[PDB]
């Protein structure tokens, strides 16, 4: 029926089997669940978060979409989440158990952190249940390690110019770049230039999963928001590598 007041519930990165035992139980006991999604020109919502929730046989009545276009004002998501907080607060006032869900982990580049600021300063009971980051899941779906003994790992997100990844590469073991859409027109020439093992992973664990280590397989590919890149020598270990 309920338990907490405001909970940031990580869904994991797309495969519903990769939610935690705890996150899943929190969802089933929540009174209301807010999820992010995007809308196209017509209606037609796209929401990876909702696609995941739909696998849990939850009461479709308790679900509250927070909807945006495709935008980059520190992700119009911040305003969208901000705008939605009032209702979440009133639900919490009504004595309800509110979940705000995140693809991957709620504390790792998630706008849910805006809800947990406000929740904590308005003195409400709030919590974070963590989830598997997308880059962790990508490494495992490719059958490779991301980090071994003495490695460093640098994680970047919303890369500005492709030159930012280029500079980082040499001073770091593995580099991970999230949200590749922001360099969708620069990715392929970067990859030809780099000429070193990489993992491209899109929609991992989800219906349209696509993972590749071949530049040719990306030449005429649309690079969407939910996609990431791993540049690392360890990519040689993957099942997707000729090196075995």
């Amino acid at each position: 029926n309920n338990q907490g007041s405001i909970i940031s519930v990580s869904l994991g990165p797309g495969d519903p089997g990769l939610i935690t035992v705890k996150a899943l139980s929190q969802l089933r006991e929540a009174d209301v669940i807010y999820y992010p999604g995007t809308v196209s020109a017509s209606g037609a919502v796209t929401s990876v978060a909702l696609d995941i929730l739909k696998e849990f046989d939850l009461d479709p009545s308790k679900l509250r979409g927070m909807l945006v276009p495709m935008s980059r004002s520190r992700g119009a998501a911040e305003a969208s989440y901000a705008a939605n907080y009032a209702s979440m607060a009133e639900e919490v006032q009504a004595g309800r158990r509110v979940a705000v869900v995140s693809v991957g982990d709620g504390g790792f580049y998630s706008t849910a952190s805006a809800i947990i600021e406000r929740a904590r300063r308005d003195g409400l009971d709030c919590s974070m249940t963590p989830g598997i980051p997308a880059f962790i899941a990508a490494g495992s779906a490719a059958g490779m390690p991301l980090a071994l003994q003495s490695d460093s790992v640098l994680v970047l997100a919303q890369i500005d110019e492709i030159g930012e990844l280029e500079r980082a590469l040499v001073t770091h073991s593995t580099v991970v770049v999230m949200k590749l859409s922001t360099v969708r027109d620069e990715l392929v020439s970067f990859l030809e230039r780099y000429a070193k093992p990489f993992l491209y992973a899109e929609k991992v664990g989800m219906a349209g999963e696509f993972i590749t280590m071949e530049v040719d397989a990306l030449r005429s590919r649309a690079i969407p928001y939910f996609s990431l890149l791993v540049c690392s020598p360890h990519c040689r270990q993957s099942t997707l590598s000729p090196f075995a």
Copy 2:
């Protein structure tokens, strides 16, 4: 029949048995045999966070097989747990090899997976939540926002590694803080900025702090990490001072 016989690298997550994925837990319950890592001191005392997590799931205890490695002969030198696995696999059996955290992220399992894979075996990987991700959520802080970077180090030799990295990176996580235990308090005094220290997150004896004074007498164990980040001031733990 024996023509099956598989091996899976199953991540356990960071410590709280509630932070196992639904899928990894199902795989452990289905497995015929479950190998877990652990270490053994000279007086023969066994330390194994992995077995401590397994002990929380109601598994058949006769299914569990320790892969214990002396804290000594570094490769240790005991990859010879695999021939055992292969045999079980040869015998038609479902073998799980487990990892604390994620099995691809500074893990004990990678060297086993590579051996399986040099051999003809399929060894899929089920992911888990790394300890540093769990530590952030336990403290109620985010680890990264909009265009932030995250740098992860582990088993660092010397405290300078960290100091140096923090000149040019805002958020730096260091895993296996034991390696710099003698230097931690002094480092944190001169650092004089928000930090999160976390030990046994999600388990009995969880200890997390953003107070240097809570560390002055503390035994900093091997499964210990530090996060240095301004994001630490976004926790009810960040010094009321």
